[PDB]
Amino acid sequence: MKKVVTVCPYCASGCKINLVVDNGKIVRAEAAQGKTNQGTLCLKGYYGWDFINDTQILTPRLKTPMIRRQRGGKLEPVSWDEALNYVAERLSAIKEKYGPDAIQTTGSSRGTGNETNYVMQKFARAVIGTNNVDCCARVXHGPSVAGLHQSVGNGAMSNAINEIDNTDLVFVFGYNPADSHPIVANHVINAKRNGAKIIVCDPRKIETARIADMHIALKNGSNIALLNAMGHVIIEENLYDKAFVASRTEGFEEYRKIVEGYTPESVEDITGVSASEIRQAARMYAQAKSAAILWGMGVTQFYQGVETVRSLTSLAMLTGNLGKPHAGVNPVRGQNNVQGACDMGALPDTYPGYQYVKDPANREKFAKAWGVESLPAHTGYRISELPHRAAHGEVRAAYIMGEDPLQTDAELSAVRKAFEDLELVIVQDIFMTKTASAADVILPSTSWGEHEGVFTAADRGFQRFFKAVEPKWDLKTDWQIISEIATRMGYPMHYNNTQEIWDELRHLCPDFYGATYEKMGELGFIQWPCRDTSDADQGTSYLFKEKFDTPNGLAQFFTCDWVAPIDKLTDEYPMVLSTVREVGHYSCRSMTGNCAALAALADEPGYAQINTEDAKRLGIEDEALVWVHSRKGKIITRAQVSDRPNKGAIYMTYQWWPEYKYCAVRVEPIADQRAAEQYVIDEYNKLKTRLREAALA
Ligand SMILES: Nc1nc2c(c(=O)[nH]1)N[C@H]1C(S)=C(S)[C@@H](COP(=O)(O)OP(=O)(O)OC[C@H]3O[C@@H](n4cnc5c(=O)[nH]c(N)nc54)[C@H](O)[C@@H]3O)O[C@H]1N2
Ligand SMILES: Nc1nc2c(c(=O)[nH]1)N[C@H]1[C@@H](S)[C@H](S)[C@@H](COP(=O)(O)OP(=O)(O)OC[C@H]3O[C@@H](n4cnc5c(=O)[nH]c(N)nc54)[C@H](O)[C@@H]3O)O[C@H]1N2
Ligand code: SF4
Numbered sequence: 001m002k003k004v005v006t007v008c009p010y011c012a013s014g015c016k017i018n019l020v021v022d023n024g025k026i027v028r029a030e031a032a033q034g035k036t037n038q039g040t041l042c043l044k045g046y047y048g049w050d051f052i053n054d055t056q057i058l059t060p061r062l063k064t065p066m067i068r069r070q071r072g073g074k075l076e077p078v079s080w081d082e083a084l085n086y087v088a089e090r091l092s093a094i095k096e097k098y099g100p101d102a103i104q105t106t107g108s109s110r111g112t113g114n115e116t117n118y119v120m121q122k123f124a125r126a127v128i129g130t131n132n133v134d135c136c137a138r139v140x141h142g143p144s145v146a147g148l149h150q151s152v153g154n155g156a157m158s159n160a161i162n163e164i165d166n167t168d169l170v171f172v173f174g175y176n177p178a179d180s181h182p183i184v185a186n187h188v189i190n191a192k193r194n195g196a197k198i199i200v201c202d203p204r205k206i207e208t209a210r211i212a213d214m215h216i217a218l219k220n221g222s223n224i225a226l227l228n229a230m231g232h233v234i235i236e237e238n239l240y241d242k243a244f245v246a247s248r249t250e251g252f253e254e255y256r257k258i259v260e261g262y263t264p265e266s267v268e269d270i271t272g273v274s275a276s277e278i279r280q281a282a283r284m285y286a287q288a289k290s291a292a293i294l295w296g297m298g299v300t301q302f303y304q305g306v307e308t309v310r311s312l313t314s315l316a317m318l319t320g321n322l323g324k325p326h327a328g329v330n331p332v333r334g335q336n337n338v339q340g341a342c343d344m345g346a347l348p349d350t351y352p353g354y355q356y357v358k359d360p361a362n363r364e365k366f367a368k369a370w371g372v373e374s375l376p377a378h379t380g381y382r383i384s385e386l387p388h389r390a391a392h393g394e395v396r397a398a399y400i401m402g403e404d405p406l407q408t409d410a411e412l413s414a415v416r417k418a419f420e421d422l423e424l425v426i427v428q429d430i431f432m433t434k435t436a437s438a439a440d441v442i443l444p445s446t447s448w449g450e451h452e453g454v455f456t457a458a459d460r461g462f463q464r465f466f467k468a469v470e471p472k473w474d475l476k477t478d479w480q481i482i483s484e485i486a487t488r489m490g491y492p493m494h495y496n497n498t499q500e501i502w503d504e505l506r507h508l509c510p511d512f513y514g515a516t517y518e519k520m521g522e523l524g525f526i527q528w529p530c531r532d533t534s535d536a537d538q539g540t541s542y543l544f545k546e547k548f549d550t551p552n553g554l555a556q557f558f559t560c561d562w563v564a565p566i567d568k569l570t571d572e573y574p575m576v577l578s579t580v581r582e583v584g585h586y587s588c589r590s591m592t593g594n595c596a597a598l599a600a601l602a603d604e605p606g607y608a609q610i611n612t613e614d615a616k617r618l619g620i621e622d623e624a625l626v627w628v629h630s631r632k633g634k635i636i637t638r639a640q641v642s643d644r645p646n647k648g649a650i651y652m653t654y655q656w657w658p659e660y661k662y663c664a665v666r667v668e669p670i671a672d673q674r675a676a677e678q679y680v681i682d683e684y685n686k687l688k689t690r691l692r693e694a695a696l697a
């Protein structure tokens, strides 16, 4: 009986967990003293280790390689030799026929770890010869989509999670940590215990709003209108930091011109917030000695979302809430390793350590390190473009590792046809997912629990996680799989352990070089940049102390005009639909839904939060199934009738089996509940049986 230290594989809070191991099996999980969690876990860390054991509650663990030889055929189990040879031969053949850019790779933001992601992008670049490497969820980063990067030159959380506790004001905008990042919510609560003020800008009455000094309950989609009026108040009442603006920013005058028209009064009907409330919130934010903005992954989907991110960041620039502790702009992103995948250069325009492929010095270094003559300079395809590339023949093969697009991507029949248009789809996962079940080849990897590595938490904190248990089947780690494919394609690659991979990237990434395995250890939390291996360098708590990471080191102001959501409301569709996380289950659900304790918590088809008054009016009872009508769409869901959602909007916990957050819908009650209930059981049994048969064939 021993404790093996790991990091939670769910959200990006980065909680350290001691997995109790007795006789080669995990026996229970308990909170370890991680930097972020300090002996606490939410439900998911505590009960969510159970999927490792292949419970088969929702879907089985992948146990063997598989190949679907004919297109409308069965996945058949095969040896590793057969699978890895097949893939190396197909990829090689595709590369020679169509060029390297005909192949798309993905990183993975989940249990695999940082080392895997570095290896995947190495494979794409040194072996295949393409920059086509990307992750679904990604930090604000590229030229093709606006974000934080244009404002401050880094898409990361500017300040640590542990810095939240001593901020004077937490400005939570489009963010629900109580359900999304329970341990981050504990830091917000502790900030309030420590006397911080709290402003929540959220249409709904979320948990954090209960403890908020102001809950700005703004109409769904009204974000830029509110943000501009807040900037208007800050500028017109002279509450901005003039020194900071003069010396550390540009673009003020152009921003001032736009927000000048946006009086709190001009925006009362649009935001549903009184001008007085707008003034008070803008005052509270501007007057706090140090204020941290927290927002969610989240804001970028409300669209005007990427403008909203910059408009928010502009508020922090306006008030000098950047380049000092307990302040900042802090997109707390979702997945346990969304940050790390990006750190490892699982993005189409950059090597690990945000060393852009367009720089010839960077190409030279990596090329030399990687024993290759030339590395490609042009930006690869984004995984979100896959349906378009596949349809038009630009991408012929997808190597999809640790992503489930046929579950978790907008319009599921788009990526389905994408898989049809593609010549070859490889899925490397730990479960028979919807996506894996539609693949040509399945490569089963080890899971979190069965291997080790490094994750990067929400605030760029590198942490080690250790192997607790041996895989029960003949599994390879993700990086073992890639390395073997790489070698079979003519490029010698092998590693004996993740430290070898980590040490290689350290020597290629000046901002990660100091973050040795020894420095991270069992409980260390090392935020990058960490440049010196000396134990004197323990990382960077917050960014931008001296300058910003923009070309000329000045932060860049931005906002724009408010534009009403594209899906307008009608008498035919009088409700807003938006999506929302729930604490007890995680998104893919292949992990939480395969945990006996967590699975007992959440019913199918899932829940839709409806306002009490809306429900009264519509004849919708609590717990009663309901239909939700959009356009080219209708869905069945369960009513969670509460006063938490705002009247006029329903919030679906959409984890169940580009404006994701605003959508015009109608909600109709079901007369025959018993038939609708049976129907739900019927469809869930269908899917469960389908994935079962896919796996045990
Ligand atoms: N328990 C659990 N936690 C998770 C996950 C999970 O599946 N389960 N998934 C993780 C992942 S991958 C992600 S991306 C995160 C997502 O977590 P979040 O970043 O928190 O995204 P949401 O919860 O979907 O939306 C957050 C808030 O946006 C509000 N909102 C909706 N419309 C508007 C608007 O127009 N303006 C404003 N200001 N607010 C609005 C909603 O009411 C909600 O409270 O959760 C992460 N954590
Ligand atoms: N319409 C719409 N579109 C959206 C989103 C939305 O809300 N709505 N969300 C966006 C972001 S926020 C989310 S996090 C992202 C989710 O997709 P993804 O990461 O691929 O699914 P995932 O479910 O987390 O699947 C992760 C897979 O990884 C497997 N896995 C987990 N651990 C490992 C491992 O160690 N090795 C390997 N090879 N695989 C592993 C999981 O089983 C799962 O299939 O896509 C964006 N698009
Ligand atoms: S899901 Fe998030 S808050 Fe909960 S134990 Fe895991 S890392 Fe911590």
Ligand SMILES: [Mo]
Pocket (backbone or CB within 6 Å): 137, 297, 333, 334, 335
């Ligand atoms: Mo996410």
